[PDB]
Amino acid sequence: MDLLEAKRLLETGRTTPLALLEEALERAKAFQDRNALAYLDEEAARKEALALTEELRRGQVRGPLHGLPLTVKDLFPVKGMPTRAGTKAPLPPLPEEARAVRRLREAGALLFAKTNMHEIALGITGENPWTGPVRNAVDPSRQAGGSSGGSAVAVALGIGLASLGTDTGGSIRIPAGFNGVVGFKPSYGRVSLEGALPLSRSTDHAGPLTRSVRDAHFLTEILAGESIPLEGVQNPVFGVPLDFLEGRLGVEVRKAFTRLLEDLPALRAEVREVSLPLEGVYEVYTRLVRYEAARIHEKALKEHPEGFSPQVREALLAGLALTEKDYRDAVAEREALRLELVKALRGVDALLLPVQPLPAPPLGTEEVELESGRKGHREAFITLTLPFSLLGVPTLALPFAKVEGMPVGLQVVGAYGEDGKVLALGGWLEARLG
Amino acid sequence: MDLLEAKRLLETGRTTPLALLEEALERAKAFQDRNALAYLDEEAARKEALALTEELRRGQVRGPLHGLPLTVKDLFPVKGMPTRAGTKAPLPPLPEEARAVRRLREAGALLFAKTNMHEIALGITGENPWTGPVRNAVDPSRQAGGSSGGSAVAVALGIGLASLGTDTGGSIRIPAGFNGVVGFKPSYGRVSLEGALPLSRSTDHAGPLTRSVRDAHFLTEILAGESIPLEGVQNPVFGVPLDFLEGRLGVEVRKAFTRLLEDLPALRAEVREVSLPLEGVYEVYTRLVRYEAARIHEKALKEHPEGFSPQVREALLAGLALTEKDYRDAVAEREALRLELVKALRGVDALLLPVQPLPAPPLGTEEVELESGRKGHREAFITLTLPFSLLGVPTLALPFAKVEGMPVGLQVVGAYGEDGKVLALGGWLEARLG
């Protein structure tokens, strides 16, 4: 079941906050081999669940999420819970509770655990030598992906009804696709990242991982502290950046995506090719993010570099090697790319493209096979998502197909501020997809 | 007369390039004391004028601007002319001709002079101790304003039919307002700034100064190298950011603006209040721009600081005092404001607000009187324009009122990439204003 479904059961008295927690805890124990949780205090959780249950009986409701069990990516401070960000290195000062978390707590949600994540959110594999890897919800021998891997798996397996994560280069969308769940990255700044561990301040996005589009819409309003109206959808027009996708997809995802485009007309939708070159976007993003990330962890990298894994340590050092000039160039280059996206979105309701070039790869996979040849993991899996987080436009990731039994996600991209439209379009597609 | 009317006279054989030039040169001589020109070579100009005249007589049209006299702000390199940028300090290496200038030249335009500008474009007063102040076209005792001051005054006085300038925080719109001409700042990057002296690469904009909105559109298409469709206007809906304007207008401009709002309904238009807080936007803009500007002139500031005026030197030094950390924060703060502007524009065709809080003030005026009390000149006159250049959205400035017998301009703000819509709405308003 999902959030709104469980909410209705609570309102009709068919279930209780305590019961919902027990089911979540039961799933957490049965799927420990997935290693999705970074921190879990069953005792404190049960105590809180008891209070929420008794409150529901006395007629006291904290908010719209009252009694609903949720998890939080371990980069958001949560009261009574430690924050480790998947690393052994010290972290910069952070408050007791992130603003976004406060929104959930004040709404009555029951935050019962922190989810694992790729070390300091700098990576998308989900493999972590410090905490152990997070394993794919569908196949325990494949990657859960990242860096909100634990959150995605938790939601997929029923460990909590939803989860809160972050997306800088696709860290919400990628794991959502890998594990067959919904991941929404709102327009930049929509949801507050105050109090949370930063990676790339001008590119980080806070967002939900859910089992349905309606839950993503519902949760985003609470997280943003504002209503996001949903409009009706009829004869939607979808733009497809074929030039951008050329040679960036795997053979199987290519077939599934092509099939989707072929079936849309029958579903009464329209498919139009659009142009989205975005030349150099990969390195623009990489330099901008690594430069900022390295500065965030500069002190720890100097005093306690051994606290970082080899991959992260190398990435941070590479960021430190980038000069302020390199940063200024990247900043200017990002601004230059905006018009290109505006034009591509002009005339269509949203852009559609896979969120991944292949299904979740086996654990340890460093190179993958694309339709245009072998490519490095990072470049193959981050290129499809980074442009939209870099430019800050609302982007939803939802399941649209399967490859050899593994989930493959689809991206729905809208213009800046069109969060409601993207979610509306997402629900329309979700209903007509598998 | 304007560009398109002169172009009509040329096609009908009622005038020649040589005659159009002589007219421009007579005006330059007559109003020479306004000090609008930084460089003028009459002989070289006349020589080119002769060539264009003969070519036209034998049906050899170079382009849409063939034989039309135009001026260029002195930060854009022009063949056969020196580039001084209103300063005595050494400048970074620049090519012989700026890309935007090449667009004009290849169109057949007769570029006969460089216009003066606030030193290195870092300022909006138009006062320059090196070249002497550029004086307002209407009243030489008042500021021409800046930093495309000479360009606006030249256009206002008929010294050339149009001009090319830049706008980073309002450098095109402010002088246009002050002198009663049209100034258009297209979406960021639409007009190439390649080969031109930069101030803030991620915030600079190239744009035209004209006598009419139709000229602004005409020239922008040529400068951008692409056609910009002009859709009809019917029942336009204008958004007014009252909260943003609260206390930032002078009593008289407030009255003129209110009058316009009162008349729009009778003109078959709608006026809706919108919210645009943009708290701290002034500081964000200032730090971001000064940081980038200081790095451009870093070498000269160290080697020949005396080449910069005190005012400019102080701003540049403030830019060097800001660290890369301050820049990263400024970069993040800018992105945080983007959603606010997007939301204010949703549901309306454009935003309307004065381009200035008061008519051009006397030279040397450091403090002014706003409806909320005294305020420093810079903050009073840059705060109204900087948000739109900071965020890169198309913004038009056109005359709409008179105060103290001085011109007062109006800003028409559109969504990113909607230059055509802005220009169309500008034409609609122009035909219904004064």
PDB file of C-alpha atoms in Angstrom, chain B residues 143-336:
ATOM      1  CA  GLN B 143      22.898  62.396 -15.340  1.00  0.00           C
ATOM      2  CA  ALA B 144      22.777  60.539 -18.653  1.00  0.00           C
ATOM      3  CA  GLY B 145      22.987  57.638 -16.544  1.00  0.00           C
ATOM      4  CA  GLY B 146      24.686  54.242 -17.262  1.00  0.00           C
ATOM      5  CA  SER B 147      26.987  52.441 -18.199  1.00  0.00           C
ATOM      6  CA  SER B 148      25.524  52.605 -21.927  1.00  0.00           C
ATOM      7  CA  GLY B 149      25.056  56.343 -21.328  1.00  0.00           C
ATOM      8  CA  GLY B 150      26.625  57.693 -24.487  1.00  0.00           C
ATOM      9  CA  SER B 151      24.650  55.178 -26.530  1.00  0.00           C
ATOM     10  CA  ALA B 152      21.292  56.220 -25.079  1.00  0.00           C
ATOM     11  CA  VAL B 153      22.048  59.936 -25.439  1.00  0.00           C
ATOM     12  CA  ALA B 154      23.265  59.453 -29.017  1.00  0.00           C
ATOM     13  CA  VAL B 155      20.046  57.631 -29.951  1.00  0.00           C
ATOM     14  CA  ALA B 156      17.916  60.230 -28.162  1.00  0.00           C
ATOM     15  CA  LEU B 157      19.631  63.087 -30.013  1.00  0.00           C
ATOM     16  CA  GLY B 158      19.694  61.451 -33.440  1.00  0.00           C
ATOM     17  CA  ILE B 159      23.455  60.870 -33.420  1.00  0.00           C
ATOM     18  CA  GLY B 160      23.008  57.652 -35.352  1.00  0.00           C
ATOM     19  CA  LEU B 161      19.675  55.804 -35.629  1.00  0.00           C
ATOM     20  CA  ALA B 162      20.399  53.168 -32.975  1.00  0.00           C
ATOM     21  CA  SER B 163      23.157  51.870 -30.749  1.00  0.00           C
ATOM     22  CA  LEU B 164      24.581  48.685 -29.252  1.00  0.00           C
ATOM     23  CA  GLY B 165      25.255  48.511 -25.522  1.00  0.00           C
ATOM     24  CA  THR B 166      25.293  46.057 -22.609  1.00  0.00           C
ATOM     25  CA  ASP B 167      23.200  45.442 -19.502  1.00  0.00           C
ATOM     26  CA  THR B 168      24.459  43.567 -16.437  1.00  0.00           C
ATOM     27  CA  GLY B 169      22.415  45.198 -13.696  1.00  0.00           C
ATOM     28  CA  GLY B 170      20.450  47.640 -15.820  1.00  0.00           C
ATOM     29  CA  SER B 171      23.087  49.340 -17.968  1.00  0.00           C
ATOM     30  CA  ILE B 172      20.786  49.359 -21.009  1.00  0.00           C
ATOM     31  CA  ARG B 173      17.398  49.938 -19.363  1.00  0.00           C
ATOM     32  CA  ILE B 174      18.527  52.652 -16.922  1.00  0.00           C
ATOM     33  CA  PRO B 175      20.053  55.004 -19.515  1.00  0.00           C
ATOM     34  CA  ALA B 176      17.122  54.317 -21.856  1.00  0.00           C
ATOM     35  CA  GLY B 177      14.726  55.393 -19.120  1.00  0.00           C
ATOM     36  CA  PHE B 178      16.788  58.450 -18.165  1.00  0.00           C
ATOM     37  CA  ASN B 179      17.016  59.706 -21.747  1.00  0.00           C
ATOM     38  CA  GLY B 180      13.602  58.683 -23.070  1.00  0.00           C
ATOM     39  CA  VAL B 181      14.563  56.003 -25.578  1.00  0.00           C
ATOM     40  CA  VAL B 182      13.880  52.285 -25.989  1.00  0.00           C
ATOM     41  CA  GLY B 183      16.281  49.769 -24.508  1.00  0.00           C
ATOM     42  CA  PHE B 184      15.976  46.016 -24.853  1.00  0.00           C
ATOM     43  CA  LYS B 185      17.815  43.406 -22.782  1.00  0.00           C
ATOM     44  CA  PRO B 186      17.128  40.052 -24.489  1.00  0.00           C
ATOM     45  CA  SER B 187      17.234  36.707 -22.717  1.00  0.00           C
ATOM     46  CA  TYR B 188      20.739  35.947 -21.478  1.00  0.00           C
ATOM     47  CA  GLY B 189      23.047  34.767 -24.257  1.00  0.00           C
ATOM     48  CA  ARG B 190      20.687  35.390 -27.170  1.00  0.00           C
ATOM     49  CA  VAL B 191      23.067  38.067 -28.496  1.00  0.00           C
ATOM     50  CA  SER B 192      26.714  36.995 -28.464  1.00  0.00           C
ATOM     51  CA  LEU B 193      29.119  38.808 -26.175  1.00  0.00           C
ATOM     52  CA  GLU B 194      32.116  37.097 -27.791  1.00  0.00           C
ATOM     53  CA  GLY B 195      35.027  39.484 -28.351  1.00  0.00           C
ATOM     54  CA  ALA B 196      33.543  42.112 -26.045  1.00  0.00           C
ATOM     55  CA  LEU B 197      35.058  43.262 -22.764  1.00  0.00           C
ATOM     56  CA  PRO B 198      33.190  41.365 -20.048  1.00  0.00           C
ATOM     57  CA  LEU B 199      32.093  42.652 -16.638  1.00  0.00           C
ATOM     58  CA  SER B 200      30.232  39.653 -15.241  1.00  0.00           C
ATOM     59  CA  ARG B 201      30.272  36.809 -17.767  1.00  0.00           C
ATOM     60  CA  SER B 202      27.312  35.027 -16.143  1.00  0.00           C
ATOM     61  CA  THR B 203      25.235  38.198 -15.915  1.00  0.00           C
ATOM     62  CA  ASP B 204      26.286  40.398 -18.879  1.00  0.00           C
ATOM     63  CA  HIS B 205      23.819  40.966 -21.754  1.00  0.00           C
ATOM     64  CA  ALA B 206      24.243  42.600 -25.183  1.00  0.00           C
ATOM     65  CA  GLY B 207      21.278  44.589 -26.477  1.00  0.00           C
ATOM     66  CA  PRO B 208      20.044  47.513 -28.615  1.00  0.00           C
ATOM     67  CA  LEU B 209      19.096  51.112 -27.828  1.00  0.00           C
ATOM     68  CA  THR B 210      16.521  52.454 -30.276  1.00  0.00           C
ATOM     69  CA  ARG B 211      13.884  55.122 -30.848  1.00  0.00           C
ATOM     70  CA  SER B 212      11.023  52.616 -31.121  1.00  0.00           C
ATOM     71  CA  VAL B 213       9.976  49.113 -30.154  1.00  0.00           C
ATOM     72  CA  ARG B 214       9.791  47.945 -33.781  1.00  0.00           C
ATOM     73  CA  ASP B 215      13.438  48.966 -34.179  1.00  0.00           C
ATOM     74  CA  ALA B 216      14.368  47.072 -30.996  1.00  0.00           C
ATOM     75  CA  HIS B 217      12.815  43.870 -32.370  1.00  0.00           C
ATOM     76  CA  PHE B 218      14.305  44.416 -35.836  1.00  0.00           C
ATOM     77  CA  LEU B 219      17.814  44.953 -34.507  1.00  0.00           C
ATOM     78  CA  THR B 220      17.592  42.137 -31.947  1.00  0.00           C
ATOM     79  CA  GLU B 221      16.807  39.622 -34.710  1.00  0.00           C
ATOM     80  CA  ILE B 222      19.898  40.788 -36.597  1.00  0.00           C
ATOM     81  CA  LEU B 223      22.041  40.771 -33.447  1.00  0.00           C
ATOM     82  CA  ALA B 224      20.833  37.312 -32.454  1.00  0.00           C
ATOM     83  CA  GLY B 225      21.023  36.027 -36.011  1.00  0.00           C
ATOM     84  CA  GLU B 226      17.538  34.534 -35.818  1.00  0.00           C
ATOM     85  CA  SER B 227      13.952  35.582 -36.434  1.00  0.00           C
ATOM     86  CA  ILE B 228      11.766  36.343 -33.430  1.00  0.00           C
ATOM     87  CA  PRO B 229       8.035  35.775 -34.114  1.00  0.00           C
ATOM     88  CA  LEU B 230       5.710  38.583 -33.008  1.00  0.00           C
ATOM     89  CA  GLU B 231       2.314  37.213 -31.994  1.00  0.00           C
ATOM     90  CA  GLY B 232      -0.722  39.465 -31.853  1.00  0.00           C
ATOM     91  CA  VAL B 233      -1.729  40.978 -28.535  1.00  0.00           C
ATOM     92  CA  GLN B 234      -5.242  40.601 -27.128  1.00  0.00           C
ATOM     93  CA  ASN B 235      -6.404  41.181 -23.557  1.00  0.00           C
ATOM     94  CA  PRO B 236      -2.860  41.252 -22.136  1.00  0.00           C
ATOM     95  CA  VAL B 237      -2.548  40.354 -18.452  1.00  0.00           C
ATOM     96  CA  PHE B 238       0.143  42.299 -16.608  1.00  0.00           C
ATOM     97  CA  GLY B 239       1.504  41.340 -13.213  1.00  0.00           C
ATOM     98  CA  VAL B 240       2.613  44.058 -10.802  1.00  0.00           C
ATOM     99  CA  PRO B 241       5.023  43.121  -7.958  1.00  0.00           C
ATOM    100  CA  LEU B 242       3.717  45.598  -5.396  1.00  0.00           C
ATOM    101  CA  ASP B 243       5.559  44.028  -2.454  1.00  0.00           C
ATOM    102  CA  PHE B 244       8.864  44.309  -4.341  1.00  0.00           C
ATOM    103  CA  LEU B 245       8.113  47.957  -5.214  1.00  0.00           C
ATOM    104  CA  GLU B 246       6.956  48.902  -1.729  1.00  0.00           C
ATOM    105  CA  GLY B 247       8.952  51.953  -0.657  1.00  0.00           C
ATOM    106  CA  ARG B 248      11.328  51.790  -3.623  1.00  0.00           C
ATOM    107  CA  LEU B 249       9.717  54.420  -5.848  1.00  0.00           C
ATOM    108  CA  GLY B 250       9.782  58.194  -5.593  1.00  0.00           C
ATOM    109  CA  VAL B 251       6.377  59.783  -4.880  1.00  0.00           C
ATOM    110  CA  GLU B 252       5.997  61.216  -8.410  1.00  0.00           C
ATOM    111  CA  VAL B 253       6.943  58.037 -10.283  1.00  0.00           C
ATOM    112  CA  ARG B 254       4.626  56.151  -7.944  1.00  0.00           C
ATOM    113  CA  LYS B 255       1.822  58.446  -9.096  1.00  0.00           C
ATOM    114  CA  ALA B 256       2.668  58.049 -12.782  1.00  0.00           C
ATOM    115  CA  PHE B 257       2.838  54.267 -12.456  1.00  0.00           C
ATOM    116  CA  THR B 258      -0.464  54.154 -10.558  1.00  0.00           C
ATOM    117  CA  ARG B 259      -2.101  56.232 -13.309  1.00  0.00           C
ATOM    118  CA  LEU B 260      -0.981  53.681 -15.891  1.00  0.00           C
ATOM    119  CA  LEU B 261      -2.378  50.857 -13.786  1.00  0.00           C
ATOM    120  CA  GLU B 262      -5.651  52.791 -13.524  1.00  0.00           C
ATOM    121  CA  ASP B 263      -5.895  53.235 -17.307  1.00  0.00           C
ATOM    122  CA  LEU B 264      -4.947  49.705 -18.446  1.00  0.00           C
ATOM    123  CA  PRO B 265      -8.437  48.277 -17.789  1.00  0.00           C
ATOM    124  CA  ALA B 266     -10.000  50.888 -20.078  1.00  0.00           C
ATOM    125  CA  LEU B 267      -7.357  49.916 -22.648  1.00  0.00           C
ATOM    126  CA  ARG B 268      -8.746  46.375 -22.583  1.00  0.00           C
ATOM    127  CA  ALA B 269      -5.907  44.928 -20.493  1.00  0.00           C
ATOM    128  CA  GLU B 270      -5.885  43.304 -17.051  1.00  0.00           C
ATOM    129  CA  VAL B 271      -3.727  44.138 -14.040  1.00  0.00           C
ATOM    130  CA  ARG B 272      -2.960  41.560 -11.352  1.00  0.00           C
ATOM    131  CA  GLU B 273      -0.849  42.002  -8.247  1.00  0.00           C
ATOM    132  CA  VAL B 274       1.909  39.392  -7.950  1.00  0.00           C
ATOM    133  CA  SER B 275       4.435  38.630  -5.207  1.00  0.00           C
ATOM    134  CA  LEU B 276       8.170  39.031  -5.865  1.00  0.00           C
ATOM    135  CA  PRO B 277       9.984  39.382  -2.492  1.00  0.00           C
ATOM    136  CA  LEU B 278      13.520  38.808  -3.758  1.00  0.00           C
ATOM    137  CA  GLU B 279      14.846  39.599  -0.295  1.00  0.00           C
ATOM    138  CA  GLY B 280      18.572  40.282  -0.303  1.00  0.00           C
ATOM    139  CA  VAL B 281      18.728  40.364  -4.106  1.00  0.00           C
ATOM    140  CA  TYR B 282      20.672  43.628  -4.068  1.00  0.00           C
ATOM    141  CA  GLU B 283      23.522  42.109  -2.000  1.00  0.00           C
ATOM    142  CA  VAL B 284      23.521  38.847  -3.993  1.00  0.00           C
ATOM    143  CA  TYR B 285      23.839  40.715  -7.290  1.00  0.00           C
ATOM    144  CA  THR B 286      26.514  43.046  -5.959  1.00  0.00           C
ATOM    145  CA  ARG B 287      28.782  40.313  -4.598  1.00  0.00           C
ATOM    146  CA  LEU B 288      28.376  38.049  -7.611  1.00  0.00           C
ATOM    147  CA  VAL B 289      29.120  40.787 -10.161  1.00  0.00           C
ATOM    148  CA  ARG B 290      31.942  42.505  -8.244  1.00  0.00           C
ATOM    149  CA  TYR B 291      33.632  39.140  -7.693  1.00  0.00           C
ATOM    150  CA  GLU B 292      33.587  38.281 -11.405  1.00  0.00           C
ATOM    151  CA  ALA B 293      34.455  41.831 -12.484  1.00  0.00           C
ATOM    152  CA  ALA B 294      37.431  42.017 -10.137  1.00  0.00           C
ATOM    153  CA  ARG B 295      38.884  38.814 -11.569  1.00  0.00           C
ATOM    154  CA  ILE B 296      38.644  40.263 -15.079  1.00  0.00           C
ATOM    155  CA  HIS B 297      40.656  43.354 -14.146  1.00  0.00           C
ATOM    156  CA  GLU B 298      42.773  41.691 -11.471  1.00  0.00           C
ATOM    157  CA  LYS B 299      46.083  42.151 -13.304  1.00  0.00           C
ATOM    158  CA  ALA B 300      45.465  45.809 -14.175  1.00  0.00           C
ATOM    159  CA  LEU B 301      44.235  46.537 -10.646  1.00  0.00           C
ATOM    160  CA  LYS B 302      47.543  45.260  -9.275  1.00  0.00           C
ATOM    161  CA  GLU B 303      49.819  46.760 -11.931  1.00  0.00           C
ATOM    162  CA  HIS B 304      48.039  50.037 -12.732  1.00  0.00           C
ATOM    163  CA  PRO B 305      45.385  50.767 -10.084  1.00  0.00           C
ATOM    164  CA  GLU B 306      45.681  54.489 -10.807  1.00  0.00           C
ATOM    165  CA  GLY B 307      44.190  53.817 -14.225  1.00  0.00           C
ATOM    166  CA  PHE B 308      40.817  53.271 -12.546  1.00  0.00           C
ATOM    167  CA  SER B 309      38.729  56.064 -11.009  1.00  0.00           C
ATOM    168  CA  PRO B 310      38.260  56.013  -7.199  1.00  0.00           C
ATOM    169  CA  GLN B 311      34.620  54.818  -7.429  1.00  0.00           C
ATOM    170  CA  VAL B 312      35.443  51.987  -9.822  1.00  0.00           C
ATOM    171  CA  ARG B 313      38.625  51.087  -7.955  1.00  0.00           C
ATOM    172  CA  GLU B 314      36.699  50.789  -4.688  1.00  0.00           C
ATOM    173  CA  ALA B 315      34.114  48.477  -6.282  1.00  0.00           C
ATOM    174  CA  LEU B 316      36.830  46.345  -7.865  1.00  0.00           C
ATOM    175  CA  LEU B 317      38.697  46.140  -4.538  1.00  0.00           C
ATOM    176  CA  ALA B 318      35.478  45.077  -2.838  1.00  0.00           C
ATOM    177  CA  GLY B 319      35.358  42.366  -5.500  1.00  0.00           C
ATOM    178  CA  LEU B 320      38.867  41.191  -4.614  1.00  0.00           C
ATOM    179  CA  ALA B 321      37.981  41.242  -0.916  1.00  0.00           C
ATOM    180  CA  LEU B 322      35.234  38.698  -1.622  1.00  0.00           C
ATOM    181  CA  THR B 323      36.570  35.134  -1.643  1.00  0.00           C
ATOM    182  CA  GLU B 324      35.590  32.149  -3.766  1.00  0.00           C
ATOM    183  CA  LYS B 325      33.416  31.094  -0.810  1.00  0.00           C
ATOM    184  CA  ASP B 326      31.464  34.361  -1.033  1.00  0.00           C
ATOM    185  CA  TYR B 327      31.089  33.702  -4.752  1.00  0.00           C
ATOM    186  CA  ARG B 328      29.796  30.154  -4.201  1.00  0.00           C
ATOM    187  CA  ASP B 329      27.214  31.561  -1.764  1.00  0.00           C
ATOM    188  CA  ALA B 330      26.217  34.278  -4.230  1.00  0.00           C
ATOM    189  CA  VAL B 331      25.867  31.637  -6.958  1.00  0.00           C
ATOM    190  CA  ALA B 332      23.633  29.511  -4.715  1.00  0.00           C
ATOM    191  CA  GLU B 333      21.603  32.517  -3.554  1.00  0.00           C
ATOM    192  CA  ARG B 334      20.925  33.444  -7.182  1.00  0.00           C
ATOM    193  CA  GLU B 335      19.537  30.000  -7.935  1.00  0.00           C
ATOM    194  CA  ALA B 336      17.359  30.242  -4.821  1.00  0.00           C
TER     195      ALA B 336
END
